[PDB]
């Protein structure tokens, strides 16, 4: 029947950005119209495809990538960004055709005295490849001296907590982000809209 958009946007659990969730959506029909119109989503920006023309188009694969970040960091979910989220947590490709949907979730993903459940990676030796996921927890060597698995002077634990409080201003608030990833190949199409 219809592609399962209830399962991705109204999921009970949203992942931390370093451990982002990829659900694959294939072999169904998808009405993106109700999503674009909804004022629930503050951010709904598409790259390389018009938001009007979503129900016309046909794609080989559509992936749903979903995670929770800070409100400032929503800027980094775009092709050709840099920053701690784009370099070390979630990287889009340069040739990214797809849509970035985000909304505020301050009321669910903050509790009083901080929500320490959501983390982000702060250092990595290289920047990530596109759509790469790192859940490693080795100590980052920031200095000349080797780390021996211990948080030391120039030896740092790579995952940092957001620690979302509701008293934080809007830039430091939890936003849930869904990334729709349209892949086009020389393969046959699997997901078209209602109008095709």
């Amino acid at each position: 029947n219809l592609c399962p958009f209830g399962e991705v946007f109204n999921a009970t659990r949203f992942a931390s950005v370093y451990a982002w969730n990829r659900k694959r959506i294939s072999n169904c029909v998808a009405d993106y119209s109700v999503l674009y119109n909804s004022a629930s989503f503050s951010t709904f920006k598409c790259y390389g495809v018009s938001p009007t023309k979503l129900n016309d188009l046909c794609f080989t694969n559509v992936y749903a990538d979903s995670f929770v970040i800070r409100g400032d960091e929503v800027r980094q979910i775009a092709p050709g960004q840099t920053g701690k989220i784009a370099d070390y947590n979630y990287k889009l490709p340069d040739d990214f055709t797809g849509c970035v949907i985000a909304w505020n979730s301050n009321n669910l993903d903050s509790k009083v005295g901080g929500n320490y459940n959501y983390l982000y990676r702060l250092f990595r030796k290289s920047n990530l490849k596109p759509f790469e996921r790192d859940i490693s927890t080795e100590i980052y060597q920031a200095g000349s001296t080797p780390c021996n698995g211990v948080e030391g002077f120039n030896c740092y634990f790579p995952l940092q907590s957001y620690g979302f409080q509701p008293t934080n201003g809007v830039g430091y608030q939890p936003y849930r982000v869904v990334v729709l990833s349209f892949e086009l190949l020389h393969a046959p199409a699997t997901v078209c809209g209602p109008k095709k």
Epitope: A15, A19, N21, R22, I135, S136, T137, E138, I139, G149
Partner: nanobody, 114 residues
């Protein structure tokens, strides 16, 4: 859905030991990341000991005191907590990360008196 079975904890004398366990069910925990984080009251939650697939990794004050082990067969991670000090009083939460999500335990209270 995925669940985590935290077990262990309670009160101990300073210099005492403990052992925490966290057993994982509901998913594929091949090459997964398992270990413990602690939150003393009013402080930020900070990490204690953790194994991702490449390396295991320990907090600064617990090297030599605490030891992390897992058997992949039972999908359980263990934390042998020796030489306990009243600084170590915190709620201890296990963290399991599979291919799809990071999951947290509910938290076992560990309390050390002088």
């Amino acid at each position: 859905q995925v669940q985590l079975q935290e077990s262990g904890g309670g009160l101990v004398q300073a210099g005492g030991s403990l052992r925490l366990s966290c057993a994982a069910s509901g998913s594929d925990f091949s090459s997964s990341t398992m270990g413990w984080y602690r939150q003393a009251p009013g402080k930020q939650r900070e990490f204690v000991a953790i194994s991702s697939e490449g390396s295991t990794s320990y907090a600064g004050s617990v090297k030599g005191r605490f030891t992390i082990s897992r058997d992949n067969a039972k999908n359980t991670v263990y934390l042998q907590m020796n030489s306990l000090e009243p600084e170590d009083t915190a709620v201890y939460y296990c963290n399991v990360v599979d291919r799809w999500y990071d999951y947290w335990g509910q938290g076992t209270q560990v309390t050390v008196s002088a």
